[PDB]
Amino acid sequence: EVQLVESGGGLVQAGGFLELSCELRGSIFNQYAMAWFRQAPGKEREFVAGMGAVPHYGEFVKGRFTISRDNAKSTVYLQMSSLEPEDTAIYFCARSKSTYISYNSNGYDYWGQGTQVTVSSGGSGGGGSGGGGSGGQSVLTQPPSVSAAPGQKVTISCSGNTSNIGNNFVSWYQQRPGRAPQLLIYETDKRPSGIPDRFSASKSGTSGTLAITGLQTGDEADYYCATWAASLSSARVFGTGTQVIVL
Amino acid sequence: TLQCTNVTNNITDDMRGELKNCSFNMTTELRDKKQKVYSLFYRLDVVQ
Amino acid sequence: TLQCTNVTNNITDDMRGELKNCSFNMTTELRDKKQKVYSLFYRLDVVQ
Amino acid sequence: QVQLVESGGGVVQPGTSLRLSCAASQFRFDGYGMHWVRQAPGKGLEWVASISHDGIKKYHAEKVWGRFTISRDNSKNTLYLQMNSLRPEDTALYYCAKDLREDECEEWWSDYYDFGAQLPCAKSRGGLVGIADNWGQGTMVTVS
Ligand SMILES: *[C@@H]1O[C@H](CO)[C@@H](O[C@@H]2O[C@H](CO)[C@@H](O[C@@H]3O[C@H](CO[C@H]4O[C@H](CO)[C@@H](O)[C@H](O)[C@@H]4O)[C@@H](O)[C@H](O[C@H]4O[C@H](CO)[C@@H](O)[C@H](O)[C@@H]4O)[C@@H]3O)[C@H](O)[C@H]2NC(C)=O)[C@H](O)[C@H]1NC(C)=O
Ligand SMILES: *[C@@H]1O[C@H](CO)[C@@H](O[C@@H]2O[C@H](CO)[C@@H](O[C@@H]3O[C@H](CO)[C@@H](O)[C@H](O)[C@@H]3O)[C@H](O)[C@H]2NC(C)=O)[C@H](O)[C@H]1NC(C)=O
Ligand SMILES: *[C@@H]1O[C@H](CO)[C@@H](O[C@@H]2O[C@H](CO)[C@@H](O[C@@H]3O[C@H](CO)[C@@H](O)[C@H](O)[C@@H]3O)[C@H](O)[C@H]2NC(C)=O)[C@H](O)[C@H]1NC(C)=O
Ligand SMILES: *[C@@H]1O[C@H](CO)[C@@H](O[C@@H]2O[C@H](CO)[C@@H](O)[C@H](O)[C@H]2NC(C)=O)[C@H](O)[C@H]1NC(C)=O
Ligand SMILES: *[C@@H]1O[C@H](CO)[C@@H](O[C@@H]2O[C@H](CO)[C@@H](O)[C@H](O)[C@H]2NC(C)=O)[C@H](O)[C@H]1NC(C)=O
Ligand SMILES: *[C@@H]1O[C@H](CO)[C@@H](O)[C@H](O)[C@H]1NC(C)=O
Ligand SMILES: *[C@@H]1O[C@H](CO)[C@@H](O)[C@H](O)[C@H]1NC(C)=O
Numbered sequence: 001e002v003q004l005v006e007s008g009g010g011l012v013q014a015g016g017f018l019e020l021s022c023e024l025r026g027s028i029f030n031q032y033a034m035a036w037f038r039q040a041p042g043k044e045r046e047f048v049a050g051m052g053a054v055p056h057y058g059e060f061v062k063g064r065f066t067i068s069r070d071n072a073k074s075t076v077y078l079q080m081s082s083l084e085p086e087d088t089a090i091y092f093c094a095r096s097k098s099t100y101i102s103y104n105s106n107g108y109d110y111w112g113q114g115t116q117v118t119v120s121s122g123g124s125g126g127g128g129s130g131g132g133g134s135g136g137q138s139v140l141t142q143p144p145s146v147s148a149a150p151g152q153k154v155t156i157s158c159s160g161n162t163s164n165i166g167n168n169f170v171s172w173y174q175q176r177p178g179r180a181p182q183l184l185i186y187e188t189d190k191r192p193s194g195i196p197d198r199f200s201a202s203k204s205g206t207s208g209t210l211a212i213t214g215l216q217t218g219d220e221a222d223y224y225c226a227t228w229a230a231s232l233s234s235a236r237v238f239g240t241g242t243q244v245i246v247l
Numbered sequence: 248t249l250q251c252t253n254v255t256n257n258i259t260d261d262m263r264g265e266l267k268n269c270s271f272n273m274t275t276e277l278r279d280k281k282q283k284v285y286s287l288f289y290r291l292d293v294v295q
Numbered sequence: 296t297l298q299c300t301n302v303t304n305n306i307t308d309d310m311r312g313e314l315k316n317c318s319f320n321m322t323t324e325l326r327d328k329k330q331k332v333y334s335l336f337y338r339l340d341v342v343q
Numbered sequence: 344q345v346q347l348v349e350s351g352g353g354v355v356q357p358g359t360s361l362r363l364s365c366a367a368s369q370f371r372f373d374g375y376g377m378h379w380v381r382q383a384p385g386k387g388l389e390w391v392a393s394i395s396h397d398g399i400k401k402y403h404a405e406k407v408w409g410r411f412t413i414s415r416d417n418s419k420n421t422l423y424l425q426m427n428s429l430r431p432e433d434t435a436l437y438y439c440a441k442d443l444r445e446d447e448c449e450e451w452w453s454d455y456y457d458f459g460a461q462l463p464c465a466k467s468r469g470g471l472v473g474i475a476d477n478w479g480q481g482t483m484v485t486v487s
């Protein structure tokens with residue numbers, strides 16, 4: 001009695017990750033290939049993916065999905081990635097009549113009951129248009145200058161946007177007068193060997209805060225807050241700068 | 248030749264040296280290439 | 296490959312060059328370790 | 344702490360071309376990326392370009408799109424920056440920096456029936472990591 005049992009399905013936001021499965025019980029796994037078919041509402045079944053000794057994909061997959069077989073438990077997986085909202089359908093599991101895979105629906109003899117996989121984000125996760133999409137043109141805002149008595153505590157605020165600071169780490173640079181810049185803080189929670197622990201940093205939302213204790217004359221310099229990210233060029237921005245003056 | 252270090256993922260006082268985190272070189276799909284891989288072994292299955 | 300030399304320890308005249316003292320690298324029980332060993336081989340079992 | 348040398352600057356007319364050379368010492372140049380930062384006198388910093396360890400991935404800023412070219416030579420441990428279509432606003436100070444990720448070797452060449460031999464590196468992963476910790480003295484470039 002050849003029987004096919006599946007898993008997976010359910011809601012996921014657009015661009016999410018889902019994995020489906022389907023095991024074979026009543027027949028030898030290494031004698032037959034497997035395939036995935038999806039039937040959109042009101043449409044006909046179309047080939048999605050299938051693997052015997054070679055993986056094959058549908059014309060609409062565009063390299064997003066990935067099929068594998070694990071002979072240990074005789075199950076075929078389908079690592080769905082970058083799930084666009086047009087992929088919603090009922091996904092079937094089919095056992096081929098041989099070791100080979102056909103793109104037609106009549107190259108298979110045993111079918112699964114079905115499994116609805118739906119995605120209805122409708123662009124809610126992204127949307128772009130300034131927020132996330134191209135980041136517009138965001139420039140960090142910093143106070144013009146700060147001043148405090150020697151040995152006191154000073155705070156520097158570096159507020160930007162969600163993409164540059166909110167969604168990415170922030171690094172701080174110190175530029176002494178007539179001297180090369182030096183790194184002090186990287187990803188807001190670590191310092192190099194050459195910098196003492198007198199400098200502390202933290203982040204909250206889209207604003208970064210730097211805490212300096214035991215300020216001295218030698219610390220008089222210009223501080224810059226910078227963010228880097230290869231995903232988007234807008235996140236690569238340098239701060240205006242804060243001037244530290246010790247009375 | 249493995250290169251093992253103790254596991255310290257919030258261990259308990261009973262399981263102190265009983266787990267070793269080892270890394271070793273293994274051949275890839277091509278016989279002309281090696282790569283570093285790691286695995287966890289119990290203390291009873293390894294010697295110095 | 297074998298690095299071989301004739302064995303001669305007040306050897307009898309009938310055995311001028313019957314035996315060879317051959318040395319060669321060899322693999323140990325660990326793959327990434329080699330060992331230098333030697334063996335005696337009869338001339339009929341080695342070819343220059 | 345390693346030694347950084349910056350040279351190749353000078354005074355050139357607008358619309359001309361120039362090349363700047365940055366030398367690397369006391370560290371593996373091939374194992375780190377390179378970046379160029381422009382800072383006018385009395386103004387803030389401005390990232391210009393970034394290059395990966397292997398020179399495949401290239402990044403440029405909006406203000407220098409289509410006119411600034413960056414290339415690296417790991418064999419000579421020398422950095423080449425070609426400038427085209429210079430403008431008066433380009434008069435500023437350029438800083439030479441390196442990366443921090445300390446790229447390693449993913450693969451090494453193997454001899455199956457030895458496997459104890461130290462053989463050259465075959466494949467590697469690295470690049471990007473747009474973070475600078477060591478800044479050189481820089482070079483002064485004038486456009487007028
Ligand atoms: C899996 O395979 C890899 C490569 O095949 C092995 O990597 C080797 O590991 C050994 C053991 O650590 C290395 O030997 C030692 O390397 C030290 C540092 O070398 C690195 O850094 C220099 C730059 O500083 C590079 O030029 C070099 O290529 C390495 O990347 C050396 O400092 C050591 O020398 C010191 O000790 C010896 C005694 O052992 C003294 O005689 C010397 O004078 C000196 O004081 C030493 O050579 C070896 O370099 C690594 N090779 C590579 C290619 O990376 C892994 O070990 C292996 N894994 C296992 C588990 O075996
Ligand atoms: C054994 O080797 C073969 C050949 O390399 C492997 O097939 C390859 O699998 C990778 C993914 O693991 C495929 O990469 C993908 O290609 C699509 C093509 O559009 C691309 O869009 C994706 O972004 C991704 O790069 C690759 O194409 C595929 N090879 C061929 C010729 O199609 C196979 O996975 C290996 N098997 C094991 C068990 O390692
Ligand atoms: C076959 O060849 C091997 C390798 O050359 C010989 O092994 C070595 O033989 C010497 C004596 O012949 C052993 O003693 C050594 O003698 C030197 C003499 O100066 C001494 O300085 C050393 O301290 C040591 O005592 C030596 O241990 C041995 N080496 C090994 C690894 O076994 C072997 O003798 C040859 N046999 C024949 C039958 O030809
Ligand atoms: C080692 O053994 C070889 C094999 O017998 C010797 O080769 C012969 O040596 C005799 C005696 O000198 C010569 O007359 C032959 O012409 C050699 N044969 C060849 C093919 O060259 C070799 O001489 C021996 N060497 C030592 C040092 O004992
Ligand atoms: C294994 O054999 C190799 C090759 O014969 C030895 O390696 C080199 O051999 C040459 C010529 O005999 C020497 O000049 C080199 O000094 C040898 N290399 C080293 C690192 O010593 C090797 O000595 C032999 N033994 C082992 C243990 O590998
Ligand atoms: C388990 O170990 C991790 C370290 O990876 C640690 O962060 C965590 O706090 C530990 N769990 C508990 C309950 O302490
Ligand atoms: C690891 O565990 C062993 C217990 O077998 C202990 O002796 C050793 O001090 C621990 N630390 C290291 C670095 O090996």
Ligand SMILES: *[C@@H]1O[C@H](CO)[C@@H](O)[C@H](O)[C@H]1NC(C)=O
Pocket residue numbers: 304305
């Ligand atoms: C002959 O060679 C053998 C080899 O072990 C040695 O024991 C013996 O003393 C030698 N005899 C003479 C007379 O050289």
